[model samples]
Target: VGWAESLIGLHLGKVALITGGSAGIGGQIGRLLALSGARVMLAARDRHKLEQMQAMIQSELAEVGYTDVEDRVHIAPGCDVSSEAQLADLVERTLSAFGTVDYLINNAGIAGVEEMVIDMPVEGWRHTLFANLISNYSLMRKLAPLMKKQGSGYILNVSSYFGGEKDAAIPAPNRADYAVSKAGQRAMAEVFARFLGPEIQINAIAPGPVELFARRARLILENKRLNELHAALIAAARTDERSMHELVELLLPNDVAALEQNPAAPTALRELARRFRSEGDPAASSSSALLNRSIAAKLLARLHNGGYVLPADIFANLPNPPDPFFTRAQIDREARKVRDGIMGMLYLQRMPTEFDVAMATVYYLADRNVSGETFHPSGGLRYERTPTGGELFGLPSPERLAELVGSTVYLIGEHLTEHLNLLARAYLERYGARQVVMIVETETGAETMRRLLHDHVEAGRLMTIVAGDQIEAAIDQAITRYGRPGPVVCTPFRPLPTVPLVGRKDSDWSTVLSEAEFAELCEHQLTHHFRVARKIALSDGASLALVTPETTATSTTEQFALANFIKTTLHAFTATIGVESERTAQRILINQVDLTRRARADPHERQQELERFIEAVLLVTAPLPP
Candidate 1:
């Protein structure tokens, strides 16, 4: 059957052997094929979920009058591929149950270690590797002879996006072993695809975050200790003296003496306090329009508590801001917003629906014309890049900078945040981009970036995944509160890619990435970074900025050394004109700072560069409120 027919016919009369079929993607695959007229053989470490899945599929297939419904679902349990003896026995049983297995899904695997790479045990590493990577090889090698003898088969080795080597950031300390193994699987697929020839097909599916994001978000929000902290912070933001004092004690123990003596406070708190003042208070009126309306309401509430009555005019004009509270639902909403953004842009890369991936797998199995090529189901999305002070990005000042604060800012390189933070601390020290949510997109996954940015606070940068449903609501929240979503900045969370020549390791840095990885990075950038950027711009008139190290050996060398070629393409592309076109034509600005300059610049020079960058961005955006 041609691939097209496979899509239309699904798996009619074929036998499918799936590993890790107890649950998750494996179970989904089995159910899909069993209903489509294929005999499904599930191989896993256990039989509980396997039996449940088989029973469910049997009834469903029987409903459609599938012949020999009992034969349709075969469970080859006790085949923990980690044990060679058990795996071989299972393979033998698989051949006996079904004349031949036509579809092979290598989905059996265990989750990675929670500890950092350095802290993990050698035994742990080997254990995970044996299960996830070596086991796949064992299955592939064992199954290949049977498959070739039968003249055809399709093998889907489940490879994760994290382990594919394209994104250097994908591999980190915590997931190092998992990444190493998964990367090996991809490399193995490439090797065997060539080795096995066009007869037996091989491919892999790299899925991004789906259910996991929500699950993790739930964990963080539901933690009793963390929720208590968040609750206290909220009350403190509302001027609850008790809560504020507690918060200060928790945040700064040694500095408690100064705060208790004089409530005016340290930098972060003083900033928060300043935002809470109402316009009617003598101190607040003197504070002028700089006093945020939401914060004013909080201050008014505090004043009301203090027995200070507000004039009717001020009372009538003030917006009744809701009491601050951080609930699990709020966290879920934040997570979902990020999930929507990621999944929407990466629809092709991620399985859009359970059935779509099933169909794609069927198509690949049936289509003799397709083999060896890595196909992305989620490909058709938008792709969108960077560089130079003046020669880099163009600028257009929007009519309202405050309105533009609820915009999207794209920071397309490694250490660009470091650059941005420095820039903010210098020239834009008073920049009003509050509740600034910076979405650090890393090939390494959000887990790594979350930790990396845990202490990184600059540009009022609250590294989070939240997006506001309405800009008006978010903007109001941002102006009056800390950690509100004003301008959402998206930067890749991994280091820059530094490619070196194969032989000399001294040839131009671009050669460091294998041809395949570099190509993949370009595609990823277009699909993710660029596409998301356009989505933000289309939805709201947000300003876009791309920061990268400029193209001189001297200027880019440091970043080049640190970059993960595929992981850092967003930074690499800034050296090219293609990035500039995307920027200037769309009224986006690209700041290709000379790291050479950044490293060498005195405090005064750093301020000048920052002032220049701010002017360049505001040139394309609205002017900030005084």
Candidate 2:
């Protein structure tokens, strides 16, 4: 068929040949053939009969809003398709109509010849085979190379499901003519598909029980009957690929898995399940709908907020589906593998009973997103054109609306709540603030900031923007330390920790996270932030971490003085001076602390790493200590 849009400059000029192009199946095809702007030479047993069908074909075209290319359906001086000379004449005229040949549709045949094999005539059998079966091989012999010469062309071998068991419309019968002919067509199509995938687009459309006539009312009435038989036959067809027992064995869930079994023990599939999808996961039975929905709705609603730092080039591909955006960064090598796995697991390997498998797979994808291996589309992302895809492309969170609720729901139960807390902690320790304000300065920036802050904010540290500077002020206060006897330390980073969570339950998917749950989130987050900050700060010179209760201690009600004095001293003396850590102001103490500048592994492990280092240095150098 000629494409509506011109594909490569010389679009509809390709030549084609169609069988039985007068009435019924062949006649309907004639209308499409003519509409394609291709010159079709209609061939049938009676020349006069062909003339009558040619007019009827014109009426069909007008109905579909096509009027320009009607002359393409002209009659040819040829024998019926059953005759070799007739097939040759049809091919010759088609070549003349379009200057040369490029494609072929082997669809000329009749089904009325059905009869018991015992009573069939030899001539009748010969005509049936020649008309439908041999006619295909004959066309390929002449057309295959002409297509090859064009460097690239198409060969669509149209066939029918003539002998399969009954559906809603027709019952099976002892008709070798129709069934055998279609079967031969299938074999030839496969051969072409195999060797020609690289160069040509060769395919076959096996349309069973299509209604080309006026009496299609039976299909509506017999749909249920049709479905039963349709499903049964499809079941039988699947036997060629894999067995049912093997499939079932592949999906069986181990309900008896131990409570304390090492989570890292299972196969990628089992570990994914045990840690994420299995109901037995530590947080699997959570009954808080409000917690889940609050997190989900809050996240979902913020994706479209203003501060979305959309890159300057996030223009759409013009015309595309309205799925989560695909971006350029995702196409990098590692991203494609994640995309591939997501597509393969979600679409191909998914089973009905093993919902936990799907949940685990989706959750794993979200985790990957969080890890920064693949893009998580902070707030949102945009792209220029449709790509083959990348790591974030196939992520379940990108498509499944329900999966969104499930993933966010598990975040709090597992280390994610704690992760957010640690991030809050990191924000706390690094910036010295409890209330984090993502400033979307520009109109578009607000959308981006909301999303950036959503996953990291829980009820405890979760402060959305108020009319004035509430969040900034809150953070400003938390980061301030005054009149202190010692310096505060920060946490260090390592392999990111995972939260303890499980497959989503119905209730968990229904609501949002609550205020109390949010505090735990901040606590967990502060813990991790404590770890990461200490490592990074000690590595730098300005961070004088007072590992606590060294040989001295001092009290200060004024946090600002303590903060200003320490920062002033470091800013004047060391390169380690930077933003004040918020976590320090909230959890830090002014106890006499040992301190030093040398950086090493595991700074957060001991309580005195920074305290001892700073105390000894100041004790040696300071006037008051002497």
Candidate 3:
């Protein structure tokens, strides 16, 4: 509120487009922008909600004695950002109304159905990715050029901290879709920053759990059982002097209570007990009160020698379950538990308000020099690594190896090399596979692989598909001829030549590589991997593994930059597809293995590393247990 008021008139005459602007953080951002003299177009799926929010903002502005509110705030109702057609319509409407766009906010997203990765439907995964990640890409593709042509523009992606930091205290056990999409948003900003002109700046704002406007009311209504239990716990804590002392010690270790006074003598501690006793105003609870509540909850869980009974606990261990294992009510209750756990772990001991997120957005929008950066407005949250120590490269047991008896392995790559030959032979001897299908870019590569594995080829244990112009079609044909594809491993021979960053005028770029070389690299590395992943995902392949060279040197040279960027981007893509494929009934397992420089430098080391890499691949692609 303080910052919003101070930034008044800063965006005078500016035109801003915000998605998911009907409610929550998006709604708050639109309100602040409009109040600050910006012409804002709010887009969302709900037409009624959009219009309602539009009128509310106008009414609030009028109350403040501000005129010209009629034209400042507009609503593009029924605009589903996930749909390209709807997004295009949204853009056209904004342009027709405002004449030009200055700011674009990619904020619309969905927290797909909460289910474990193994049980998650592919449709839900795709919907979440399309809504959160793909929609941002589509909107940016359409609006970035418009902004560039206008000579100046700013884009902000409202991402989540879950996307940026996996080791955060946040519990994302069944929310892989949301996590993956958010991560892609952050990565997309970095990649786009390399290409978009200097005049156009793109950045991401990753915030933790936001305190929605109706959060308190919704929680009270939904968590009636949990709320009652929490109240009972607080009452017990107040009566039991021993427990109260322990609770105070857990919550406020530094605060000292007078020796003569009771354990709850501290003013803050007394107030925390009172707030929980009343159980009426959760939104107004202070940070201290929040932490106290979390401690009390844990104490109560320990007191009963069993966990707190949540709404979904009653449905646990049910026999002869219905078509859906968990009902909608039960699923929602489980999700609430995950949310509560996340809120309790926040270092600040309080959820961030929508205003906090909006202020961050305004800061990025106003700061013209900042681009390709991620700003986290997550209330002092810190990530601590949770290590599960074990042998780094333990081999699977003989019994586990029996799972790959007759499975078919596809070795897909742009070139035919001894590496592929080594991997193919290893698969045949180690895994007892029915056959190894080699998909290469050229006939020469196919012939070379054939000569290397001539014995297997004669015995019909090796097959080669030349993927020249129609790689997808060739892969499809192979899959059609073969029964069920096991692991589709992509092996790129080497990194592409470095491409100069956009807007750089240095002559060093020309000395390193030509335009043709850069284009070919993109095709061979990025495009080829993308196509193979898409084909395998569509064909319901068992799994996909990517093989890349390890570049550990911290050199700032052009070649290192290109290699690092390519590898980083591929890893990001691999992770994204890994989660995306979980939606399929087949549950495709996607992974990557990095060939070390040491291995490439020496033949004996190369053979050892390749064996280890194959072992790693087999470990990841092993069949899931029933």
Candidate 4:
């Protein structure tokens, strides 16, 4: 009568282990199953809730007239999912209590500490992955063999709203760890599903939002505030659409009047512009309007001042979440998508109950045919944003060729580890790879140098590159005997400091590069002390490759400026030379490697980066013309 009573009672007589089961979605699921005659073991760090939960389940079972409630309910309290020892104990305890864990609802996790990805420490990332992903893996690893013994089991990994979103292409500001970890869970679930299919069902459900009343009220307030600001952002993005400077300008009386007259120029724009214009002096700029609007004003003001490079606080402290799904490069495209999403939300829609989500989970577990499949219980709609024509974004090129084998390689750079790694692997594939004489220098770390040579260079079936000043002789010998070597791979090695010496500064520049000898050093640097003897090589039909490192702004001094300039000039040289030759084309390439400044610190990471970099550049650059 009153929305009709529930029907088709599910008796999940089998045992279920639900992590983080003391509260939130996990607790609700636990309560539903325990009441529905299922033996449910709740795992959580909350000891008091666990104690109360058993009694509550027993009482509720009695009220509903279901027997054996005591045996059907259990709790593995004091469990931190991130802790390996605790997780191991939880599994052991669950097996001891129920004999076999039939369903595993891995719901335990925490959104990592709020901080910008750039500023985030390794530990923060480690914790987020360990708690949200690795912990689930640990449980699965221990339980997989147990389930295999039984020849049947179900694994329901509880992923988050952040998990399925295409927000990864853009930086998430503070939420990178959470986003990355959540995305990883989806991948892991798919991998495990394939490995343990038919017999053991393993699937992950990614949910948007779950109802929790007190927090829901707070969330409602937060959403309202965020939408208000996001609307303003959309309007600002639409207006002028020129540059960051446009937002900072004062709204004239006419501009405000125009907005008021336009009525249809996005309701959000009219309200914001009118409000500010009315509050400020007729002659003054919009800065007066912004001076009072709190968080919304702060964000807009930052865009006005900071340009494309926003400060961490401006993003992290935004009223709503940052749109990692949206790129600044595609503002107009994103603006349309944003507006459409807002338009859709205006239509009336029914919200799903927690009961509905819990019941859906039960339905999946009850049915035997639904193995190795994901069941998105709540709403079950794909709310995540997707790229338009995203297919070609990461598509690898079709053909693969040993392009650099016969190249006239002139290696230059302060850090050539990855470059060298790339060359070594390229050479190893061919017995007759051309001799690459590297013109470079290394001021320190001989041990690292030895490892690079042994791992990559000595793996023979190759003629390897090196770092030293023995280039002029090698080039002469190759030209005299072997003829033109083809293209030159210039690894960026800056052997000169960009600035002259100072009297007193950090790093004891006073002692090392004192002002007493500053003039002499300047003369030396000005006279092109760090210049390479490579004009002759380029003139002799050898192509140029100027390697540009990641634009992470490692050094904000003149060094990076000069390096970029070098790369740009080399590219211009290739283009101009091609035209001057009156020939068809010149095989020139500029590889901008997206490696961290820390690539040298870790060898394995360094190797992987190098391999990918080499592969990408090789695919793009044409092989030496036969």
lDDT (0 to 1) per candidate: 0.48, 0.35, 0.63, 0.50
TM-score per prediction, in order, is: 0.43, 0.30, 0.59, 0.48
Q: What is the C-alpha RMSD of each candidate to the true structure, in Å?
A: 17.3, 32.5, 16.1, 19.2
The reply for model 3, stretches above 4 Å from the true place, is 1-4, 121-123, 166-171, 212-336, 382-419, 425-455, 463-591, 594-626
**Candidate 4 pairs with clashing backbones:** 250-285, 250-286, 412-491, 412-493, 413-492, 413-493, 414-493
How do the candidates rank by lDDT, highest first?
A: 3, 4, 1, 2
What would the per-residue lDDT of candidate 2 be over residues 353-469, giving only the tens digit for each residue?
Answer: 222221222222222112101111111111111111011111122122222121101001111122233333333343333343321113343334345456555443333322121
Give candidate 1 misplaced runs (Cα > 4 Å). 1-10, 114-122, 165-174, 208-214, 218-334, 337-341, 347-351, 379-626
lDDT per residue as tens, model 4, 1-626? 22112421565557888998887678777887776667889999989988787778778777677677788889988999878889889988998998878788888878684433222344565677668766776677667666766678778887654554322221222455565456555544554464566567877675545442333233233333333443454455554554433332322222445654564455555676567556433433331223223344433432332123333443333223223222232334444554455335432234456666766776666776654344667543334333211111221343224455454444444355656645645644442355544444544423344455564435433233333454434445445544554545554443335452111212333233322232232222211111222222223345444454433234433334333322322222232222322211222332222222321226775566566666544543435435
| Candidate 1, 479-565: lDDT as tens digits | 334322223333333333444322121223234444344323333332234333323322222444443332223434434322222
- Compare candidates 1 and 2 on TM-score and give the better one: 1
lDDT of 1 at 76: 83
- Ranking according to TM-score, highest score first: 3, 4, 1, 2
Error of 4 at 338 (Å): 12
Candidate 1, residue 5: how far the Cα is off, in Å: 11
lDDT of 1: 0.48
In terms of TM-score, which candidate is strongest?
A: 3
